[PDB]
A paper describes a structure:
Furthermore, we showed that the formation of this complex was mediated by the PDZ domains of NHERF1, which bridged CXCR2 and PLC-β2 by binding to their C-terminal PDZ-binding motifs. Remarkably, the PDZ-mediated interaction of NHERF1 with the C-terminal sequence STTL of CXCR2 was essential for the functional assembly of the CXCR2/NHERF1/PLC-β2 complex, and disrupting the interaction with a cell permeable PDZ motif-containing peptide was sufficient to block the IL-8-induced CXCR2 neutrophilic signaling.
To facilitate NHERF1-CXCR2 cocrystallization and reveal the mechanism by which NHERF1 recognizes CXCR2, we generated a chimeric protein with the C-terminus of the NHERF1 PDZ1 domain (residues 11–94) fused to five amino acids (TSTTL) corresponding to the CXCR2 residues 356–360. The crystals diffracted to high resolution (1.16 Å), and the structure was determined by molecular replacement. The crystal structure reveals a polymeric PDZ1 arrangement with the carboxyl terminal region TSTTL of one PDZ1 molecule bound to a neighboring PDZ1, which leads to the formation of a linear PDZ1 filament throughout the crystals. The CXCR2 pentapeptide (TSTTL) binds PDZ1 in an extended conformation, forming numerous contacts with β2 and B and burying a total solvent-accessible surface area of 692 Å2. Specifically, the side chain of CXCR2 Leu0 enters a deep hydrophobic pocket composed of invariant residues Tyr24, Phe26, and Leu28 from β2, and Val76 and Ile79 from B. These pocket-forming residues are important for NHERF1 functions; for example, mutation of Tyr24 and Phe26 completely abolished the NHERF1-targets interaction and significantly altered cellular processes essential to tumor metastatic behaviors. In addition, the side chain hydroxyl of Thr-2 hydrogen bonds with the imidazole ring of His72, with its side chain aliphatic carbon making direct hydrophobic contacts to the conserved Val76. Specifically, the interactions with Thr-1 include a direct polar contact from its side chain hydroxyl to the side chain of His27 and a water-mediated hydrogen bond between its carbonyl oxygen and the side chain of Arg80. In PDZ1-CXCR2, the side chain of His29 is oriented toward the hydroxyl group of Ser-3, participating in specific ligand interaction; whereas in other three complexes, the imidazole ring of His29 points away from the bound ligands and does not engage in any peptide recognition.
Residue numbers in the entry: 9 to 99
């Protein structure tokens, strides 16, 4: 499809089941290590995705800690707007 994928996760007993990682001296958070059978896997999340929005807010210019805080403060449901970095660029 033309729109970025929107992954809608409901928190489970072992969390969401994915890792979030940022680079050295550069903004942008990426998905890593999507656990098999997790809410992240069921929602369509894939390691290698770049995270663009959390619950309708753009997180491309925020620090790693700011993005983690947004995810954790949410009431156990997150909508993650993600893109494939190989084909997608922010300008
Ligand atoms: Cl990680
Ligand atoms: Cl690392
Ligand atoms: Cl990974």
């Amino acid at each position: 499809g033309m729109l970025p994928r929107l992954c809608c996760l409901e928190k489970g007993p072992n969390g969401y089941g994915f890792h979030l990682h940022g680079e050295k001296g550069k903004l942008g958070q990426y998905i890593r290590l999507v656990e098999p059978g997790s809410p992240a896997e069921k929602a369509g999340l894939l390691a290698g995705d770049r995270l663009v929005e959390v619950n309708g807010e753009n997180v491309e210019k925020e620090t790693h800690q700011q993005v983690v805080s947004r995810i954790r403060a949410a009431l156990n449901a997150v909508r993650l707007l993600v893109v494939d970095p190989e084909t997608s660029t922010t300008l």
